[PDB]
Amino acid sequence: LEYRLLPKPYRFSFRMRISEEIPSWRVLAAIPETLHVEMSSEDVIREGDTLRVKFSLLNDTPLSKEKQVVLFVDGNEYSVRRVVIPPFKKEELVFKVEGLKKGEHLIHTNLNTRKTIYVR
Amino acid sequence: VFSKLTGLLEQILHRRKKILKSPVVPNFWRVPTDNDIGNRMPQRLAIWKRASKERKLFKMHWKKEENRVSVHSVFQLPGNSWVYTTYTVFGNGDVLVDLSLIPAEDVPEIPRIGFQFTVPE
Amino acid sequence: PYEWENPQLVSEGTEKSHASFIPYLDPFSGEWEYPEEFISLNGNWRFLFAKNPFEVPEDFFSEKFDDSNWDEIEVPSNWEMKGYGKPIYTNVVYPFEPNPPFVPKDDNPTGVYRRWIEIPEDWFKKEIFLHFEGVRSFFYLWVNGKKIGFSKDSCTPAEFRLTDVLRPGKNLITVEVLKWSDGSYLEDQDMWWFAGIYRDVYLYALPKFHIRDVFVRTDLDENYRNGKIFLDVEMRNLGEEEEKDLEVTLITPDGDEKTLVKETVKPEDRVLSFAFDVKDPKKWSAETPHLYVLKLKLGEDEKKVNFGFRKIEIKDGTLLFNGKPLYIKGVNRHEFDPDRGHAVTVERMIQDIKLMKQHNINTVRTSHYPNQTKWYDLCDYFGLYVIDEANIESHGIDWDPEVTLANRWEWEKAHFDRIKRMVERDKNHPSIIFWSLGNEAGDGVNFEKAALWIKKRDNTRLIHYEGTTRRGESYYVDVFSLMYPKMDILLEYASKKREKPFIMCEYAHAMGNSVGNLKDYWDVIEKYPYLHGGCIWDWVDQGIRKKDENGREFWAYGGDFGDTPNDGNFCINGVVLPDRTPEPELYEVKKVYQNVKIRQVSKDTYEVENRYLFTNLEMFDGAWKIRKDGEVIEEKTFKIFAEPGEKRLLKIPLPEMDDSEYFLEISFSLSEDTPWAEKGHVVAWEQFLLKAPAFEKKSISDGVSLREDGKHLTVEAKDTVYVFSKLTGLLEQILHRRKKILKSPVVPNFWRVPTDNDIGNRMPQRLAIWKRASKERKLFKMHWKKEENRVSVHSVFQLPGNSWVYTTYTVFGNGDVLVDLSLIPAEDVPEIPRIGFQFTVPEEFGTVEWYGRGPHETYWDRKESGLFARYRKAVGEMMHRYVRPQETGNRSDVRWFALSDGETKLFVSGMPQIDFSVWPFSMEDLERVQHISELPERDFVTVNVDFRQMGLGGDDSWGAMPHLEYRLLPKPYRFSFRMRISEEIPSWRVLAAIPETLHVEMSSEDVIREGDTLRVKFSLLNDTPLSKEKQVVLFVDGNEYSVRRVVIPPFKKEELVFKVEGLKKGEHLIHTNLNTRKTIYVR
Amino acid sequence: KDTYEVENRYLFTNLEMFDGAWKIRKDGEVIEEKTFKIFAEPGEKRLLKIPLPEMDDSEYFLEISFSLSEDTPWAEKGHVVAWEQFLLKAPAFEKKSISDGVSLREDGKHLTVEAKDTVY
Amino acid sequence: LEYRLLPKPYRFSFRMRISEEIPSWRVLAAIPETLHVEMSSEDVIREGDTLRVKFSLLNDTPLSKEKQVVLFVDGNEYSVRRVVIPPFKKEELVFKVEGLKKGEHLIHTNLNTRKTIYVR
């Protein structure tokens, strides 16, 4: 198993130069490296219901990104998704949160996105 | 030199001198070993051989910046898998070459991921 | 081996495929142009017709041969339509034994054509070519006795260089034409089998050195502002030594001229490729068909091509046209005319396009072969999007991977040649947005390879083949296409991220009276992502004009030419009749395809949405109308500025309104003439109710008399006598001033004459019991009850399937009669086709008026195109002649209708509405006859008054049902209406007053033990003369606990039991919505 | 990146009353300013197309603002009533191989580290 | 909640330079950026039992790393941990896998560590 390419998203890059000498393999051209991100949900819900947290990830940069989107609730790691965004492409995700009791609850990621959610 | 009609990098001239003898093409296949023949790999993974030779160009665009130009080519493949290819050329004559591959929900395992091309002997 | 049995051999001696140059269409004048050096070969040819190839006279191709005694035939034509042989219609099965590549040698209709022609002397310093536009299905060519070669594909041209074998003065052209060939196995379309030289022929000459082919493409920038032009020119030398001058001149839509290229070129075979820039060009669309012109001249060789700047792409699954989301509002069209067959004229082609645009259609699919070059030109010029489709269909050969001709090596080069000869011929037309690989011809390597070739050749257009996408996703197409998918499928598609847009290449099968639930498709397409439209099946019924024994014309279908085997009327799938006469169902298309949407914010305030892609609403003349009880009382013009996408508000001042019923209509029409329609043509409209009416009820003080005898009850009121039968419990006769009004009794009626959709889903078998129950019935009981001002006559009737039906007639002093019907179906009966009465009046009654939807026939699932208004027609024009007679004529949502014999009026109002239809023949007549001609003469008119009739359906016509929400499921149903026989038309808003309350008793155990169950009994008596329909709600402690639906017929008690569960210790309030209350204790 | 949707949320004011301006900032300093007007009735949404320059490895940021065309009883011509900013392009980060050395001297109470003309 | 520092691990770095001129904020000194990893488990187990996958992560680099360690089973995302490794420090993790049936199974991570596991 541990030597087989199972059918999931995959990315891959390399640099090529055609020149009279051999350039330093450690040096590369600088490029931007950040994704644009938006989070969005129902700011509220009824005890028992389900919270739907939507995430848009835009990749304006010239390379394939491979990211692990982690959702935290009240500081504790609740869920994670693996994404592969190709260049000049947006990707949308939905997470489903279950079991929130009455009172306010902190929804945040590992992509600098945060939001207080009320439970009537 | 890129082709609008095949969305492939076709030719590289270096001081008016041809470096390619055939385009740079995504390549998913490998020549079956004795082990591969024994476990019917050529039958089971046939769709990846076809996807190494044929591909539809869905879309193709470019974007210039002061110091670089990006050439994107979106390609659907036998078995209905998508493959994205992005070339960035920089002022200093470097080219970055990226490939994403998004397989279709019902395709079997992949022999190989990578590019293939031919140069003079 | 014979050349006409060998699939690997596709032709011989034919020139390579190239773009169309002849005939040219001049966009500025709209006239057809030809080359100077040009000889037509249209007209009379000596013709010989044989049963097979081996019954042809020997040496028939030789000059010396004597043909003086031969028949003369006109070219172009299909020889079935001239007399020779018979036409054959088959759907899927081949008309010969299927064993590819073999065809019969005993039965294979053959046609030889001879013709002498005069070539001028000055032609031979030039190269001479003989051009067939289309032949079916195979032919050989001889010139001056010598064999030149042969060709196989029925719907792409054939071209032969002759310069060597053709002499000055008189030359002989001899053509043998076989009906069936190996080539036939890929031409198994659902259509007629014909044969013969059925498109033009002609000679032309070109210089030794000449332009062989031209490929012009266009790109647009990211803003869709500036353009580029990409020009391929291919030159061909045939013995020219001297250098020649090449000039390429652009001509704008305005008329301005620019030289792009002027250079000298040494004579050689080469392909020259140019790229030009063009600032702010005028972009081609179906709304705005702006054409440019390329003028090319090499020495004395001159050619012209029409192109338009326009870009088709997919962004994130979405289908864009010049940067805007595109919706394919499309139809499938067979090149077919009733008198000529496939040999269709330019005049008829112009008639078709204008009719399409006039009915808001924007796309045509050439089902299922390339058309005459002139079709695509006219789509360029008038403005229609085109799906061009190669001449490949092998339905009759199984699609199993081993069997299918798509996966056989020996059929490879055939598949390839048919696709390549379409692309190369049409590549320059801006109207063509999608290439289609074929139709119902399986899936395999043979289509895969040909597809990939297209995309490397032409990157500017999207590929489409349903054959592959029906088995799931397919890499080598750009568009996901299914035939007649159900809604669920569309909604499933839309539910997940998709890279490819969804298009229905065939949907809403229009066979007979059909095209149901159209709006319901488009409500889903416009709402959900990745759905971009489709093409209706189809445009024109393939009926052949024929004459019967008496000599009265009828439209002929399968098995009307002793042709066996045949698939009958399965070729009659149109929205127009063969002569282009619209079928009512076209008026629903127009309404659902319209490009303006109007929404009611408030009674006065309306929101207009502009759904065109490239047109401002400022181009259209706005009008609104108000109608009082159906007549106009106010009209006012207006203009509204709205860009593509925008919503704008429209304020309408309303008048003070009396107790009448008011309806607002808002329309848009053409400000000035266009090439396709006149000033005042309507392109969109929408209606809205402003105020419902106030209904009067009048206490009647006048009396009614009653006389019983053995076999008849007789009820006199004013000057109208009603006669009931004690023995058949039916209203038999109405005398009005001693004048008979009925020609047959008033009978309950549950049936309708089966449509093509109904036959397809076995309705006649499944629902047989309702047909029997329309003819037979037992009278169980029958009583009457007089009152001072009225008499009621009740008749209880059991029916086949064991269903009960109650009928109550109340006659009032003022000569009104109320007519009620309850129907209680039996626990194990299937769905009901129709609920309503039927009766016959004399034919004298020849003119009908009505306030409802009109003017044309509407049904439960096809009535959005019905405008509410008053209408007047003769009885003869209250039906529609369907090629196979069927259910027809229904009017929906009618307030009132009146029949008139001049003096006497038979008036019928609803309570508050009915559906009706009038015929000049019996239901039995209409079910019997299969052709329009056979519809008999009758001295009476059948009248149908109906609560409702089940939807038409037509999602397909081989199993699909009407949608659940247009089907009468077996539950209790009631229905009433008022009838009056008087010299004038009375006010439909006024009715006789009657009591309207039920008697009710509730009863239970005043107490019970915790855990037990409370049983609450309800008796409901109906003493009144009408059917009641009530919702009995049980409340406990103020909260809604349960509800029952009841239908009480007149003079009947109904008993109900409710079961209450879970009552805890203590007292509990039980009450209804019928003023019944009771405290219940729980020990 | 080049296309922006403006929404007018004034009850009784057309956006034609205001002077539009857009500015592009390279690593904080500006490099391109343009003025524009936009017709939009209360409620309306209108598109705004901004041609972008070719951009080097720097960090680019757009700013779109509306101001007063002429003086008002409560403020002077040019006063800014509304603005919004957007990231156009992230920057490319350089990493440089350092070849030069660093000395170190330990004593009882101190570690001393020398590099160029700075002691830590 | 979405503007509070809740008690979990956190890292944070910056560059400083004392010089006569202001240097380019985009240019930094290059450093190694990889972790050393080892994965280990019972090469097998009985149906019903619990597999215990151990992961060591050594940080020999001069900056604190923040990593999302993801465990895959048969190519599907099973579990994820968030770690913060300070410089010159090894961290140990244990994952518990439950509900492996009879037959061979592929355990792998997003750190280039794989292993076939058997289930008697």
Ligand SMILES: [Mg+2]
């Ligand atoms: Mg029809």
